[model samples]
Target chain A: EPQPPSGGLTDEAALSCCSDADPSTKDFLLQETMLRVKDPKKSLDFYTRVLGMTLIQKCDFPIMKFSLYFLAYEDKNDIPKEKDEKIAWALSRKATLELTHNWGTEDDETQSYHNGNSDPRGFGHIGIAVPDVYSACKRFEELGVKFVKKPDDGKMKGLAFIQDPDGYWIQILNPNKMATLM
Target chain B: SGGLTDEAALSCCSDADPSTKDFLLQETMLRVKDPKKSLDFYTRVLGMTLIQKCDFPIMKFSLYFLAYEDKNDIPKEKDEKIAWALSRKATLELTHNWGTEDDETQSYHNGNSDPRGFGHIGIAVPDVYSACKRFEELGVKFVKKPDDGKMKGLAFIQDPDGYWIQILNPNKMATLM
Candidate 1:
């Protein structure tokens, strides 16, 4: 709570944000964690249909030859319709995923986004908090989803990992279920 | 139940399973060679709470879940702490594979170079100018200053491990796109 036990935080600017009344934190919130997707068709389906996220904002950049799709665990009825309001709304949401779909990445068979879970890794997986890991994973299996790690197969009991179209891992977990197992 | 499942409303390709409906996008995990350095940057510098530290000795790895949530409400028991962390939203998980810290040449790809995959994580601050200034006063590495880039209102900084962190304010949503 008081400066994390890291010797010192002299090297990090985020140390200034420790105070509740810090001006920077007054409007602070984590936005999207962007990941490059090969195709909007496959990736969007996997995210929305398979994983149950709602597409909140989709920004097209024809010149840039790519589009940005923001998705979160939200209802369509409550989402803002106006462009600016929607973008702002998307930016303020908690743990949203911004799928960056390049126009032609899907066409090329040889091309694929590097999943950070592999060797020389940096960006890892995006996790989902499920109400029931077994039921969720069972649903994923019936949908023909690919698994990197199944819940019962690994050392950890109540969590599983499934890959997106781009090979990025999506962790499925339920803390309550996991805690009971532990 | 009648009209829309997957083909209709786009929520499911299979049967509409209630298990997945209320799921929360909880964390975006990243692998770090040095947990100490990364934790300081994230928890101290970036103002997040270290909600849980889970060490898997047999598996030879550990996971440190950090979030903006207050520590006071966290469960005191280990198992309960883990469950609480798993339920949090907008959290960052730092996976520390044992011995990477002592590897000397240990590093990660960061997804910024050729064959870019994962681009960045972001946080919206109250004022980009002042936040960047605060970051500058400390040793936080800047990928793009608010004034330097064509995108005037938002800024980008790198974590100790070279993962980009985009900083912007909601008020400057006009200049964002």
Candidate 2:
């Protein structure tokens, strides 16, 4: 759990400060974000079966001693069937998750990816937006997805946090509806 | 840049179930110490447009949503389209709690530490060498240069918060020998 700061700017003040613009920066499209996973099978099952992401591409590098799996929440039809074309397509698609599985990490119980949730907590959580928050969470529950914070568990409602097999947090929220800002 | 064999890359589209795919990857949330510094680095240095900013005074934190798209393409008003875009397209979310800026000793742990769970986010650029050169000019810290180690084309740069953001060119990704 995070501790709150003593004094903070109001929402209006923060917005007012953020209104300035910087036009010189070069814009680049987001390709993918990588997360280190201990077990490829378990992580693949959670991402593909539970989160419904299509495993667009998988690459095993024997020389490098690791495997890379790229998954996306996009149309299956859009994915290229041919190997070369699929590699191109996977490299071209925007906003995908690249799960990296080191060769011997799974075999060692002591070896695990640091989820950035503890003492030195830096990287936080990833967000998953669903149409209906309640039903989506219920489905997650039925599928045995691990929960860090259920909707009804904490002070926050309508949002939930669940853990992947690697212990990374995925924040679940409804995009259609808004949570009352505190 | 086209030397990769077809066998080296495997396709897995046949394994998908479209009916259960209702969720969109909205944001990749991470903690940043300073809102001003983060806004400057992300907006001025990285070229991301500030799509949305939500501050929770009670929670003592502010959420800043950024995207790689042009400012002209983003919604000026909060509406259904904005809501849809927020969830539909992938964006980077920078969380700045109220007091971390003032406390010199307080810092958030980056993804590469001992527990080592969260890895890094990757940005696909047009040219790896050119992008790295520009990043070098901008004084951005490089975790891995394009020529570093055995990797010839890929590089990794860090944000102000020390979160590693991998940089690679799509053209060179499949061809790196």
Candidate 3:
């Protein structure tokens, strides 16, 4: 098992290993984000139209008034592409097993362990893609994604906040430009 | 000179009207039985100061809140210990062991065979030893002392239910909170 130059292994060995039994892959697998949304229809629309995510799957648990939707990106440079696809698919169908029993009337226990983003106390916001802040914001507005921070007019950063149907926040970002501001 | 100061180097980070894009973990979740109890664990037990705790009329579930302990804890000094957890959003979700309603309770009872108390929620605390001691002083219970800090850290505690709370030094890796 050969490591990269960072691990003190030379490129020769690293390259050789790439062609051997346990090939070293430059395609790294990064962490992926999977969200549980209350309404599949709205979640699907927002993710596809605004974020440009490719839809992977959609499932229904009508008995519980709940549903799941899977989406992902196929680009090779996408760090978590594979895992994201799997996770998006899994989360889409998996949440169904937990909530199918009680359709309504507050089956808080039946909800996902994280309370399905209903409680104000749980998860705050999430991050995703943008080519340009202004264009993204405009598209988001047309698609109904909320903005917490308006795009800055000067040479600084811009901020906007959008909420999923489940009331979870998704922070739109242009990775080509800005870094996350603390 | 080609050499630049750290601030000058960082200035290259600026982007004009990078547009009004949002940058934060917005859509995350955690299930809890009681909002107040979970709130206490997140704010008081852990060092997190609550940013906002609000409920939505459209979505009927209760939200506890969001808090940032410190960016300094992110994989700063150590490697191999906690590189991954540092890159995550606010995932400190506390799913109440107690079922939500009769059906949920029944399912829980069927699964575990015991319907007792609250379950688990991972959080970030400053000093593992001090946090554990403070928790004890506050009348909270402990499952055991710190484990060997090899694979991870040296401390752990259990919630009212049978969930393990890893009291971690975030500098290492993502240990249980």
Candidate 4:
């Protein structure tokens, strides 16, 4: 049997601290996370066309040869129509995705991004919570999305993983299942 | 500008995930080589609060959770607060192993390296110009300055460990576009 690490917190202790008692009071909301992709067309299609995110904004830098695209899962109608209101809305919203495409990377087939798994592993994965994990997985399959892990493949059930065009892992889980993990 | 039909994009999504819809984004986890420098950059420079920290001495690693909010506004009761934090839309998690600080070669790749995948994290401020100005006065290194050509009114800065952070004023983005 494997022994617990000498200084590691016990299972009970870890559970207590990691549970629902810890609340944060910061006024700043997490707005978005940025990702780099070789092909803007492919990545945008994967995020907006397949995953159900709306194209909120797109910024282009012709000289720098890069472009920034913002996407969110919020309802199209609920998103403020006015500029100021949209600004406020963007500030208050949480967990949006930003895709940055460098100009020439898309043309070069050899250039691609690391999945944060090999030699220099730093940034990990992003999670997307869904109402019905099963249905979401089925939809992803029908769309020909790449899977890193399926629900039944790993010890952890009810959660699945899929890859975007850049090979970044997007974890899919049920809200109910996530709550129990808490 | 890229061609992907809007009709096809909306095809697969359900109306919404009723149970988990509100919790659209829970947290984005990243590794930091040094907690001291990382904490200083996030708290002092970015104005985020060190919300909850979990130390695993036996495991030789620690997890620090931070958010952009005030401690006073959060629930004082521990359980209530944790519940609130966990349910929030987005949080940033910094993982620091106990011994990485002492090792010279133990730096984590920030995803900005060649073959870049994960690019950066974004922070929205009330005034991008003012924030960038303050950052300059503080001698914070900027990846892209606010006044840089057409990218004016928006800027990019790096954290202590080379993780790029984009800053913009959402109010100005409308006209800037």
Candidate 5:
């Protein structure tokens, strides 16, 4: 019987107090999460324009045959400049999403990135917090965006799920509503 | 040669003219079979706060939100926790279905293999070498050691469910050498 590892997990510490954040590594920051994208043009369009994340930095590793695009949310005018400074700024930013593009992916007609929500599911989805999820979903619908879940589709309310060019799930939530005391 | 320009980007998007200037990348959700183990692995080992725990008794599932945040400041009372959690940015959410924990047969894909899309979440530590060493002593599994791969300074560690958590030193990244 291949039971789940509930009875046994390597994390042997009993915790309910102040977290066991190692004194040395506790200061660590949640920097960025990465996702593979087949087309930079399509992906970048959806991320920056549709979702309103700013393209903070772009790193092209020609020899490595890949490029990384760093994105976060900030007003356009406040965006940092210069390569070194942008990289520095981006590195310190929390929860920035990095889209990695292999050079030939855009040209390959049959290539696509598996978004991890299918048969063998992993990497569920990333959530975006908006002021008004209804309006956000309205905009998404008007823009011809594909949705995994609409705002009023399920038992849940004030949230929606949409897909990007590469079929990755993006969850939209209204922070204020969800935060309204319970 | 007129191409993808920032000026032209917004116009190409959905034309709802929505009135929202602030957009927050709130939380990333990952499925885990054993919430108890996964929660401990994240909170006890990685030093994260349990911001919110939403349970749907009728639906037979639960959602736990954790983040590298100050535990003391979080709401000790029940009602305020969800509000506080939703207002935060870049949180990690672990979702568990009813009997998947005890089922023993069903499991989640770590999304690192063939046809991979979602890579991994990153943690920027002050020192990569020390972080990796501590994780080892703490019995955490390493997918790639700092020295094992061509990338010398960074490392990748796995959570209870084999999802990758890449650790790097952003101090090195913040400056030009």
Candidate 6:
């Protein structure tokens, strides 16, 4: 018989904490990212065309004078096979990217890439589970993507941190997936 | 691209079960300057519960990781099943690196810490408009709001560092359809 994993909170314990009484009760929250940008059009182009995310939704809220967009994996239905494998190995778990810029405000204030901080405020970077942090760095290098943080290696895994053209730091993790492959 | 080959990449991902691949990268582990502040913001202000507090010396890294699980939205059994599968799903692990709080060693964010730009995280809500109000009451900052559209809703707010987090309420997202 395959024994269950030994770490993490037990189902009994986990259930109590996640109960309705808890104020932050939510279902699989967006562990993924949703970035905000000053110009949705340009940012959309870059993320979709260059990064390979599918434009899931884009619409404007006339009342709020703010526009919204949604992007995700090219195939929402398809799971990341390799990423699953790495979930057991990787640590610094998955995260999302978010870019934000107001509609009426000067795009300059919102353009994350405009400042030395590269839009440090607003919505920040998102983490993607690459097969190998080092290899991902290498491929992006070929594309001329300058990493904010480079590939790192450790006993459990290899890792790195990098920023988008906008200066958002996305941590690429390589560690035992206490969170992924249990 | 150089030296690191697909095979090498495969080494990192070989343990993954192909049957369970749905872009399951929602969970994240963050390196914080002060776990106390992060804990306060996440638990008190943000309304998340502290699920675990790990302390182990054998581990090269000593951490006081905290996780906040959302209950109202995520299905109970499903969350359990997934948590069971991932061994670490449905978790929000906040690492308090080291240094501070009496060598709490696990304390990543603390006295001498720098918020370090925006280490933003995300949360899903049923309505961005209402969620904003709640967050506002908690003293949370909102940088942007996309309160229109039938299928989408989202907003952004900052953590202590200017690290902005995007909150989404997919009320308009297609489910049954």
Q: Which RMSD values do the candidates have, in order?
A: 6.1, 4.8, 20.5, 6.1, 4.3, 13.0
lDDT of 1 by residue, B49-85 (tens): 7777766667777777888887698888878777788
Off by over 4 Å in 1: A1-23, B1-17
| Candidate 3 structure quality by residue, lDDT tens digits, B78-124 | 33212223223443433332224223332111011122111222333
Q: Model 2 chain B: which ten-residue window has the lowest total lDDT?
A: B1-10
List DockQ for all candidates. 0.38, 0.45, 0.04, 0.27, 0.45, 0.11
Candidate 6 chain B worst ten-residue window by lDDT: B106-115
Residues B1-177, candidate 2, lDDT per residue (tens digit)?
Answer: 121233533322245444366777778888988877777777767777777777676777778888876667766566744574567567998888788887989988776867676788888777888888878998999999999987789898998888889887776765565
Residue B69 miss distance in model 3 (angstroms): 21
Off by over 4 Å in 6: A1-42, A49-51, A61-66, A74-98, A103-125, A152-157, A175-182, B1-34, B40-122, B125-169, B172-177
Question: Which run of 10 residues does model 3 chain A get worst, by summed lDDT?
Answer: A21-30
| Second chain alone, TM-score for each candidate | 0.87, 0.85, 0.47, 0.88, 0.85, 0.55
List candidate 2 stretches off by more than 4 Å.
Answer: A1-27, A179-182, B1-19, B78-85
Error of 4 at A73 (Å): 2.0
lDDT of 5 by residue, B89-138 (tens): 87998888767767777888887888688889988888888878888898
Model 4 chain B worst lDDT window (10 residues): B3-12
Indicate whether candidate 4 or candidate 6 has the larger DockQ: 4
How would you class the docking of model 3? incorrect
DockQ of 6: 0.11
Q: On residues A77-125, what C-alpha lDDT tens digit does candidate 4 reach at each position?
A: 8877876776567544567887777778867777788978676888877
Tens-digit per-residue lDDT, A45-120, candidate 3: 5554555544443344443454433344322143234544544333322111111111231334444323223322
Which pairs of residues collide in model 1?
A: A14-B45, A14-B46, A15-B45
TM-score of chain A of each: 0.84, 0.84, 0.50, 0.80, 0.85, 0.53
lDDT of 6 by residue, A114-135 (tens): 2223211222234455445565
Candidate 3 Cα errors over 4 Å, as ranges: A1-38, A62-65, A75-120, A153-156, A176-182, B1-177
